[PDB]
């Protein structure tokens, strides 16, 4: 119902909880239909729960045995990295996976002492403990994630989004605030009103003076007033330091 509210009708979610397209997608559609980590993480959890409940269903219908039930769901809780695919959405879960794999080693060589190499262990208590302790840690995370997803469904996106200064946009933000800092100090020197069309033509000397600094060309402007040349020379020495 989430997939069909979002407008995505060409994605098929079959009863073993796999999401596959019903055609060959365009790129516009592949943009519109990238579901998040939160959807697919909830989806793999439902898949895992489905596998356990189906094996107890098979025990109930009389197709399998008590020992084949125990061996089946012991195999399930050991092989989640092959049966589900939760490792690719929250890779921290590889810890849980390695724990279950390590537990297999210490259980089998207590079980398989003097009785061979076949399947049939079915001592599924420790692996069960590992995945329950994973679940209680990802309750508050997935409540946060799905809360944000569903409120974007009913309520749009916040228009008020501001951008944190990161490594990506730092050399741009230094420029924005450098030029504001320069243009204030030059607007205060003027005895007139500058009326604002002149300001963006004043800052071209700041850009040209920086280009002359990089190229080690001396930057003399012939008819320049003295304190304005002092202001530009000050801020270019700042940027160069």
């Amino acid at each position: 119902l989430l997939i069909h509210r979002k407008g995505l009708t060409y994605l098929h979610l079959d009863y073993n909880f796999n999401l596959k397209p019903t055609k060959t997608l365009t790129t516009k559609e592949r943009k519109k239909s990238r579901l998040g980590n939160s959807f697919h993480l909830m989806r793999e959890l439902l898949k895992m729960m489905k596998l356990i409940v189906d094996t107890h269903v098979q025990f109930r219908l009389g197709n399998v045995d008590a020992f084949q039930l125990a061996d089946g769901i012991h195999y399930i809780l050991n092989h989640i990295g092959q049966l589900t695919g939760i490792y690719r959405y929250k890779y921290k879960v590889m810890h849980q996976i390695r724990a279950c794999k390590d537990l297999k080693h210490i259980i089998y060589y207590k079980f398989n002492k003097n009785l061979g190499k076949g399947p049939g262990c079915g001592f599924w208590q420790p692996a069960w403990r590992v995945w329950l302790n994973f679940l209680r840690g990802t309750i508050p995370l997935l409540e946060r994630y799905i809360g944000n997803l569903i409120t974007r469904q009913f309520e749009g996106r916040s228009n008020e989004i501001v951008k944190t200064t990161t490594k990506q946009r730092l050399d741009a933000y230094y420029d924005l605030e450098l030029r504001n800092s320069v243009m204030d100090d030059i607007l205060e020197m003027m005895p007139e009103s500058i009326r604002q069309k002149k300001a963006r033509t004043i800052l071209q000397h700041l850009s040209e003076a920086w280009r002359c600094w990089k190229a080690n060309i001396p930057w003399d402007v012939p008819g320049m007033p003295a304190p304005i040349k002092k202001i530009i020379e000050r801020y270019i020495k700042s940027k160069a330091d």
């Binding site: 073993n16 729960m49 356990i52 189906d54 109930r60 399998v64 008590a66 125990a70 079980f111």
Partner: protein, 193 residues
């Protein structure tokens, strides 16, 4: 709410979207009452939404600790004996269902079938006399007011022969280290150092 195509269910669909914050909690409370190898089927006490959105199993599984140790030791020994006894063990195939098959209804295909045989290591009649009649129940002495407080199932008190019988019967999972000088350089504080 199998098929919901009406002007009605406009509210119930929004409830179905609202319950997805709560699906890890429902999965946890389902999965931590996975029945056990010695049980056939157990009844859980669920709490559902009236529109049918989500269904939380509302029950915490309390066990007595030596009784649970002895139950796992009994089924450990029985699974070892059965792996030895069978020549051909058919591990089932996964995933158990087809991808295009809807999950079959409990009320039609499951509930009218009589259940099958659980693990249940067969006990002796006189060596295991005190624990034989209740070892494999769901809550083993849920209603025996001398050996339990009540059906709230919170405190337990046994005699000596019951406790001794659970001591012998749970041999494969006991600690069997009785001196503290075994953990000379494997104690917790050597690990911290």
């Amino acid at each position: 709410h199998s098929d919901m195509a009406s002007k009605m269910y406009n509210t119930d669909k929004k409830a179905f979207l609202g319950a997805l914050k709560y699906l890890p909690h429902a999965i946890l409370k389902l999965l931590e009452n996975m029945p056990h190898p010695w049980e056939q089927a157990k009844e859980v006490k669920v709490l559902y939404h009236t529109s049918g959105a989500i269904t939380f199993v509302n029950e915490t599984p309390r066990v007595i600790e030596p009784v649970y140790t002895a139950q796992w030791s009994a089924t450990w020994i029985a699974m070892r004996r059965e792996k030895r006894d069978r020549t051909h063990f058919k591990r089932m195939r996964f995933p158990p269902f087809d991808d295009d098959e809807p999950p079959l209804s409990y009320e039609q295909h499951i509930e009218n079938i009589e259940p099958l045989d659980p693990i249940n290591l067969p006990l002796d009649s006189q060596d295991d006399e005190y624990v034989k009649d209740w070892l494999y129940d769901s809550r083993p002495l849920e209603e025996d007011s001398k050996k339990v407080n009540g059906t709230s199932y919170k405190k337990w008190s046994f005699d000596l022969p019951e406790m001794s019988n659970l001591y012998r019967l749970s041999t494969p999972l006991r600690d069997e280290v009785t001196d503290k000088n075994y953990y000379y350089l494997f104690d917790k504080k050597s690990f911290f150092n």
